[PDB]
Design an enzyme around this catalytic site. Structure first.
Site, PDB file in Angstrom:
ATOM      1  N   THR A 110     -12.347  -7.223  -3.035  1.00 20.99           N
ATOM      2  CA  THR A 110     -13.745  -7.539  -3.274  1.00 20.99           C
ATOM      3  C   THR A 110     -14.113  -7.341  -4.735  1.00 20.99           C
ATOM      4  OG1 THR A 110     -14.528  -7.014  -1.063  1.00 20.99           O
ATOM      5  CG2 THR A 110     -16.092  -6.817  -2.852  1.00 20.99           C
ATOM      6  N   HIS A 116      -6.140  -6.004  -8.599  1.00 18.61           N
ATOM      7  CA  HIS A 116      -7.278  -5.998  -7.687  1.00 18.61           C
ATOM      8  C   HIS A 116      -8.543  -5.458  -8.293  1.00 18.61           C
ATOM      9  CE1 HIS A 116      -5.936  -1.947  -7.662  1.00 18.61           C
ATOM     10  NE2 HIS A 116      -4.789  -2.326  -7.137  1.00 18.61           N
ATOM     11  N   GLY A 117      -9.665  -5.784  -7.668  1.00 20.91           N
ATOM     12  CA  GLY A 117     -10.949  -5.361  -8.195  1.00 20.91           C
ATOM     13  C   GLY A 117     -11.089  -3.887  -8.468  1.00 20.91           C
ATOM     14  N   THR A 118     -12.232  -3.495  -9.019  1.00 20.67           N
ATOM     15  CA  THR A 118     -12.512  -2.098  -9.349  1.00 20.67           C
ATOM     16  C   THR A 118     -12.863  -1.189  -8.155  1.00 20.67           C
ATOM     17  OG1 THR A 118     -14.887  -2.470  -9.728  1.00 20.67           O
ATOM     18  CG2 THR A 118     -13.382  -2.839 -11.585  1.00 20.67           C
ATOM     19  N   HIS A 130       0.781  -1.232   0.000  1.00 25.13           N
ATOM     20  CA  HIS A 130       0.000   0.000   0.000  1.00 25.13           C
ATOM     21  C   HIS A 130       0.812   1.282   0.000  1.00 25.13           C
ATOM     22  CE1 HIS A 130      -3.656  -2.429   1.287  1.00 25.13           C
ATOM     23  NE2 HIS A 130      -4.042  -1.751   0.222  1.00 25.13           N
ATOM     24  N   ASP A 186       0.537   0.085 -10.533  1.00 24.34           N
ATOM     25  CA  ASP A 186      -0.167  -0.990 -11.205  1.00 24.34           C
ATOM     26  C   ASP A 186      -1.407  -0.372 -11.863  1.00 24.34           C
ATOM     27  OD1 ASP A 186      -2.019  -2.500  -8.461  1.00 24.34           O
ATOM     28  OD2 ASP A 186      -1.825  -0.451  -9.155  1.00 24.34           O
ATOM     29  N   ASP A 216      -4.848   0.492 -11.877  1.00 24.58           N
ATOM     30  CA  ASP A 216      -6.016   0.441 -11.033  1.00 24.58           C
ATOM     31  C   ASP A 216      -7.285   0.675 -11.867  1.00 24.58           C
ATOM     32  OD1 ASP A 216      -3.706   1.236  -8.796  1.00 24.58           O
ATOM     33  OD2 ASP A 216      -5.411   0.393  -7.801  1.00 24.58           O
TER      34      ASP A 216
HETATM   35  N1  LIG Z   1      -4.220   0.953   4.091  1.00 29.93           N
HETATM   36  C1  LIG Z   1      -3.631   2.154   3.830  1.00 29.93           C
HETATM   37  C2  LIG Z   1      -2.687   3.557   3.419  1.00 29.93           C
HETATM   38  C3  LIG Z   1      -2.889   4.698   2.547  1.00 29.93           C
HETATM   39  C4  LIG Z   1      -4.167   4.848   1.794  1.00 29.93           C
HETATM   40  C5  LIG Z   1      -5.179   3.796   1.982  1.00 29.93           C
HETATM   41  C6  LIG Z   1      -4.924   2.576   2.814  1.00 29.93           C
HETATM   42  C7  LIG Z   1      -5.208   1.297   1.973  1.00 29.93           C
HETATM   43  O1  LIG Z   1      -5.242   0.204   2.642  1.00 29.93           O
HETATM   44  O2  LIG Z   1      -6.216   1.203   0.996  1.00 29.93           O
HETATM   45  C8  LIG Z   1      -6.013   0.672  -0.421  1.00 29.93           C
HETATM   46  C9  LIG Z   1      -6.949  -0.264  -0.933  1.00 29.93           C
HETATM   47  C10 LIG Z   1      -7.704   0.331  -2.133  1.00 29.93           C
HETATM   48  N2  LIG Z   1      -8.200  -0.500  -3.363  1.00 29.93           N
HETATM   49  C11 LIG Z   1      -8.066  -0.373  -4.805  1.00 29.93           C
HETATM   50  N3  LIG Z   1      -8.734  -1.384  -5.619  1.00 29.93           N
HETATM   51  C12 LIG Z   1      -9.316  -2.151  -4.627  1.00 29.93           C
HETATM   52  C13 LIG Z   1     -10.291  -3.233  -4.774  1.00 29.93           C
HETATM   53  N4  LIG Z   1     -11.452  -3.152  -5.469  1.00 29.93           N
HETATM   54  N5  LIG Z   1     -10.664  -3.834  -3.535  1.00 29.93           N
HETATM   55  C14 LIG Z   1     -10.191  -3.285  -2.305  1.00 29.93           C
HETATM   56  N6  LIG Z   1      -9.389  -2.188  -2.057  1.00 29.93           N
HETATM   57  C15 LIG Z   1      -8.995  -1.657  -3.254  1.00 29.93           C
HETATM   58  O3  LIG Z   1      -6.891   1.334  -2.615  1.00 29.93           O
HETATM   59  C16 LIG Z   1      -5.866   1.737  -1.645  1.00 29.93           C
HETATM   60  C17 LIG Z   1      -4.535   1.775  -2.515  1.00 29.93           C
HETATM   61  O4  LIG Z   1      -4.755   1.129  -3.709  1.00 29.93           O
HETATM   62  P1  LIG Z   1      -3.424   0.578  -4.485  1.00 29.93           P
HETATM   63  O5  LIG Z   1      -4.186   0.128  -5.842  1.00 29.93           O
HETATM   64  O6  LIG Z   1      -2.637  -0.320  -3.512  1.00 29.93           O
HETATM   65  O7  LIG Z   1      -2.372   1.763  -4.767  1.00 29.93           O
HETATM   66  P2  LIG Z   1      -2.504   3.204  -5.723  1.00 29.93           P
HETATM   67  O8  LIG Z   1      -3.546   4.047  -5.254  1.00 29.93           O
HETATM   68  O9  LIG Z   1      -2.577   2.796  -7.242  1.00 29.93           O
HETATM   69  O10 LIG Z   1      -1.048   3.912  -5.365  1.00 29.93           O
HETATM   70  P3  LIG Z   1       0.192   4.419  -6.533  1.00 29.93           P
HETATM   71  O11 LIG Z   1       0.285   3.304  -7.618  1.00 29.93           O
HETATM   72  O12 LIG Z   1      -0.240   5.702  -7.119  1.00 29.93           O
HETATM   73  O13 LIG Z   1       1.509   4.589  -5.918  1.00 29.93           O
HETATM   74 YB   LIG Z   2      -3.034  -1.111  -7.208  1.00 30.02          YB
END
Ligand SMILES: Nc1ccccc1C(=O)O[C@H]1C[C@H](n2cnc3c(N)ncnc32)O[C@@H]1COP(=O)(O)OP(=O)(O)OP(=O)(O)O
Ligand SMILES: [Yb+3]
Ligand SMILES: [Ca+2]
Ligand SMILES: [Ca+2]
Lengths: 143, 485
Positions: free
Chosen positions: B257, B286-288, B60, B200, B202
């Site tokens: 999810t 990961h999912g949408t 994350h 990645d 998203d």
């Molecule tokens: N945990 C913490 C620290 C900082 C911000 C949020 C949180 C974090 O846990 O919460 C995360 C979970 C959530 N997410 C995205 N698609 C998902 C899917 N459908 N199912 C579940 N969750 C999804 O998005 C947050 C980060 O998504 P990520 O896809 O890991 O990185 P991203 O936003 O692309 O960062 P970047 O590539 O710009 O560096």
């Molecule tokens: Yb991601």
């Protein structure tokens, strides 16, 4: 949830001339249906005929708060349904109309006569506006 | 007409490797299904292309978008795009600190190496320039300059590892100061070796054509309902299939999810790029977003590949939503928006608004029973007639489908004035809690528009003067009958 568990407890005190949250099964159905249910006189028996072997025939919160603590599982679909409703409401007026229900159907494979359709809206319509609003679209998919 | 980008100017603004966005046109057309991507760290693209492993959902830490470590995922999140802001740069590391321990072996961290080629890629984008030389205890270091004030970097000649240190005078956001130390990047394990991670792809949202879903339902379970004598148990079984096979999603081990058509549609994508050559494995982990309800992000620009292989790019939320209204949700496709949109997301406390039709109308329909009670529930967060809850349970009486519309309108319109009555005297008694007093002044209004609506559909207070509150039975009803004529 904390709120859910904070609801079953809310309405529970709406009708109890006992005071100590000590109700009767004669009114248990009046509690489950008012709060969104439609059980049968049989479903009341078997269930209450396991945890309440006291013989008193009375009910309280701790008791009731655990019974629903089971049924309220596969039914929680509420969400899916609500999202589903929005799928039908193609125009976004808040209500599902024939024309709309037609699309959802034809595009799904099952073609329907402008008759058969207007029938589904009517058998599903509960207030006569000739349209189904979420509230309705819910019953039609729950009860 | 809405001012959006298209084709090339749109792709460029997205971040997706071109070859990839092209490879995606195919699948978008082949399955007639809209593909919607969230932004993508532009400094990540060339990394993705060269084949870097995109970061799964177990990582994350945010990717950097500046300095030498741009594109990757710095362990010291203060080198990430969240550089400068604490609660964020802080909640960042903790996240990294976890991916490294709770996944021991699966995820680690390693030194940053900027090979001869990348350096150039950066001198171009104007992110860092290789400067003057330097020697530190028999080691040749070339400095790497950036327009950043807090930190100062440099790179080694022997192994190409990059190091950073705080500049005499400044202090880290977290309040630190240190001297020369390797910049560590988040890595993943592959065949026993640690490989660096970049951004990645998203997915914002995936919305396929309603038909495309049919194909999902088994031509067996379909007929079973498609051929039901009655009509009601039919609609239910029909809709319920749309639910179960297209709308419903469950939690997966590492994809978060998602649903099933999504798992496939997802997989096809990763494969699709593996065909063009992306050797780093998956590129959609990961999912949408619409299923991300704990940490919802509201991005200005959304990338859209339509089922016709075309490229769009909404200029901003308001517009992103406008495009989804006119080309997807109002054009016979499968689409659902995040459940936390008009609520306060729990994770990050976000409050992302979105147009929800079911609410628009809320004002013109009378409340069910649950809504009433459950409103006396969340109503008692601030802070005796069960008749209003019954009359409300009466109005929506499923056992109403045997009467005729003409009939329905009557008993209902009546059941409304019946409920609007048992409410008037509750208010006529104690102003109980100032706020409860409002809820009702509200229902009374919703009750009106609804009742009135049914009347104008067919023939308000005017009629409320002539009626029996007084005794109770069908007698009260009898007077009513005539009035409506
Ligand atoms: N945990 C913490 C620290 C900082 C911000 C949020 C949180 C974090 O846990 O919460 C995360 C979970 C959530 N997410 C995205 N698609 C998902 C899917 N459908 N199912 C579940 N969750 C999804 O998005 C947050 C980060 O998504 P990520 O896809 O890991 O990185 P991203 O936003 O692309 O960062 P970047 O590539 O710009 O560096
Ligand atoms: Yb991601
Ligand atoms: Ca509609
Ligand atoms: Ca209706």
């Amino acid at each position: 949830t904390e709120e859910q568990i904070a609801e079953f407890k809310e309405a529970f005190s709406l009708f109890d001339k006992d005071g100590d949250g000590t109700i009767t099964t004669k009114e248990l159905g009046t509690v489950m249906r008012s709060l969104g249910q439609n059980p049968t006189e049989a479903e009341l028996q078997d269930m209450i005929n396991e945890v309440d072997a006291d013989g008193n025939g009375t009910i309280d919160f701790p008791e009731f708060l655990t019974m629903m603590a089971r049924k309220m599982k596969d039914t929680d679909s509420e969400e899916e349904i609500r999202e589903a409703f929005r799928v039908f409401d193609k125009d976004g007026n808040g209500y599902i109309s024939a024309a709309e229900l037609r699309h959802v159907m034809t595009n799904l494979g099952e073609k329907l006569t402008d008759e058969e359709v207007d029938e589904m809206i009517r058998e599903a319509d509960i207030d006569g506006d000739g349209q189904v609003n979420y509230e309705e679209f819910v019953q039609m998919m729950t009860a | 007409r809405i001012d959006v980008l298209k084709g090339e100017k749109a792709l460029k603004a997205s971040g997706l490797v071109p070859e990839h966005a092209d490879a995606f046109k195919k699948i978008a057309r082949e399955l007639n299904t809209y593909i919607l991507f969230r932004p993508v760290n532009k400094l990540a693209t060339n990394l993705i292309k060269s084949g870097v492993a995109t970061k799964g959902l177990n990582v994350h830490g945010k990717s950097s978008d500046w300095g030498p470590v741009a594109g990757y995922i710095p362990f010291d999140q203060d080198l990430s795009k969240k550089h400068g802001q604490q609660l964020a740069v802080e909640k960042g590391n903790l996240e990294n600190k976890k991916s490294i321990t709770e996944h021991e072996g699966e995820i680690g961290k390693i030194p940053l190496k900027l090979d001869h080629l990348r350096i150039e890629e950066l001198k171009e984008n104007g992110i860092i320039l290789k400067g003057k030389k330097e020697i530190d205890n028999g080691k040749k270091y070339y400095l790497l300059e950036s327009n950043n004030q807090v930190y100062e970097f440099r790179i080694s000649d022997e192994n190409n590892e990059v190091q950073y240190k705080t500049k005499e005078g400044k202090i880290t956001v977290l309040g630190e100061k240190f001297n020369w130390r390797n910049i560590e990047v988040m890595a993943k394990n592959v065949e026993g070796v640690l490989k660096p991670l970049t951004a990645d792809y998203d997915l914002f949202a995936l919305a396929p054509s309603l038909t495309e879903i049919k194909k999902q339902i088994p031509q067996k379970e379909w007929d079973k309902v498609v051929n039901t004598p009655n009509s009601l148990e039919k609609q239910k079984g029909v809709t319920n299939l749309l639910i179960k096979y297209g709308i419903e999603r469950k939690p997966d081990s590492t994809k978060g999810t998602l649903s099933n058509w999504q798992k496939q549609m997802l997989d096809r994508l990763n494969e699709a790029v593996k065909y063009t050559g992306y050797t780093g494995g998956d590129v959609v982990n990961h999912g949408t977003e619409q299923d991300n309800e704990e940490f919802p992000e509201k991005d200005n620009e959304i990338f859209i590949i339509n089922p016709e292989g075309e490229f769009i790019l909404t200029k901003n939320w308001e517009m992103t939503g406008r495009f989804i209204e006119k080309n997807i949700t109002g054009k016979d496709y499968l689409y659902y928006f995040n459940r936390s949109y008009n609520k306060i997301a729990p994770g990050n406390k976000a409050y992302i608004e979105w147009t929800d039709p079911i609410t628009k109308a809320k004002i013109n329909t009378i409340p069910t029973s649950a809504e009433f009670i459950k409103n006396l529930s969340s109503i008692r967060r601030s802070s005796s007639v069960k008749k209003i809850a019954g009359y409300l349970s009466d109005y929506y009486n499923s056992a109403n489908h045997i009467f005729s519309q003409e009939k329905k309108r009557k008993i209902s319109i009546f059941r409304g004035i019946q409920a609007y009555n048992e409410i008037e005297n509750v208010l006529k008694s104690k102003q109980i809690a100032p706020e409860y007093k409002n809820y009702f002044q509200y229902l009374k209004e919703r009750i009106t528009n609804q009742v009135q609506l049914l009347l104008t559909h067919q023939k308000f207070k005017l009629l409320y003067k002539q009626l029996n509150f007084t005794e109770n039975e069908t007698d009260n009803f009898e007077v009513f009958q005539k009035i409506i004529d």
